[PDB]
Swiss-Prot record:
It comes from the Eukaryota. It comes from Homo sapiens. It is found in: Nucleus, Nucleolus. Belongs to the methyltransferase superfamily. RRP8 family. Essential component of the eNoSC (energy-dependent nucleolar silencing) complex, a complex that mediates silencing of rDNA in response to intracellular energy status and acts by recruiting histone-modifying enzymes. The eNoSC complex is able to sense the energy status of cell: upon glucose starvation, elevation of NAD(+)/NADP(+) ratio activates SIRT1, leading to histone H3 deacetylation followed by dimethylation of H3 at 'Lys-9' (H3K9me2) by SUV39H1 and the formation of silent chromatin in the rDNA locus. In the complex, RRP8 binds to H3K9me2 and probably acts as a methyltransferase. The gene is RRP8. This is Ribosomal RNA-processing protein 8. S-adenosyl-L-methionine binds at H39, G74, D92, D104, M105, C121. Coiled coil: none annotated.
Length: 212
């Protein structure tokens, strides 16, 4: 049974990285128990990490004024919102928490330049990663902060990933590669994307997180 839930999780997990966000959204809409499975599995993984990226991100944000408006892109169970006093917009494909605004984070119900900080904490799952980051750019005020955490094994070439993100109107401010389980990148918004919506951007193609 325990071995089965993990097999199930590992299959679903691999599936979630393999398709566009529309696929993941449909799956969770039609099969909400799959969402429960995913998070049972995800929690079993992050429990064994000395420090979760949400907590590291919360620590960062607690050092800045709590008036900064945060968007948590792929918020899961909203530990970020629970950990900071900021206004935190919580977006995910399905809801484990009453603060969740259910949507594809490629298209969130916020105005342009409405947020100070966009967070992607282990959430850049679908193949259409460009969509997520462009939506982050849209909602971010000029000079706003983008924080990205992903498992390090997802990055076969950090250099090109960072280069591609820069093409979407961001500047790297710092990167923390010191945690053994994830890389954390802080970018600041310089403006709108500087490659048109028909440019290629291969640097964004990440490897799936396979949890060991
Ligand atoms: N396109 C999308 N739109 C909204 N949420 C998405 C999404 N793609 C992935 N997610 C969400 O991203 C989450 C990844 S697990 C990480 C959850 C949370 N940030 C934490 O650190 O605890 C899942 O809840 C998943 O449903």
């Amino acid at each position: 049974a325990q071995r089965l839930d993990g097999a199930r999780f590992r299959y679903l997990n691999e599936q979630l990285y393999s398709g566009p966000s529309s696929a993941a959204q449909r799956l969770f809409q039609e099969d909400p128990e799959a969402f429960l499975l995913y998070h049972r599995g995800f929690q079993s993984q992050v429990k064994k990490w000395p420090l979760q990226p949400v907590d590291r991100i919360a620590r960062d944000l607690r050092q800045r004024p709590a008036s900064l408006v945060v968007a948590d892109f792929g918020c899961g169970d909203c530990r970020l919102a629970s950990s900071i006093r900021n206004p935190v917009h919580c977006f995910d494909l399905a809801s484990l928490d009453p603060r969740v605004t259910v949507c594809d984070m490629a298209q969130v119900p916020l105005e342009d330049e409405s947020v100070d900080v966009a967070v992607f904490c282990l959430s850049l799952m679908g193949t259409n990663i460009r969509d997520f980051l462009e939506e982050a750019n849209r909602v971010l005020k000029p000079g706003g902060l983008l924080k990205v955490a992903e498992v390090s094994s997802r990055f076969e070439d950090v250099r090109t990933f960072l280069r591609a993100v820069t093409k979407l109107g961001f500047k790297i401010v710092s990167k923390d590669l010191t945690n053994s389980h994830f890389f954390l990148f802080d970018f600041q918004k310089t403006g709108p994307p500087l490659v048109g919506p028909k440019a290629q951007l291969s640097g964004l193609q990440l490897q799936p997180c396979l949890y060991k």
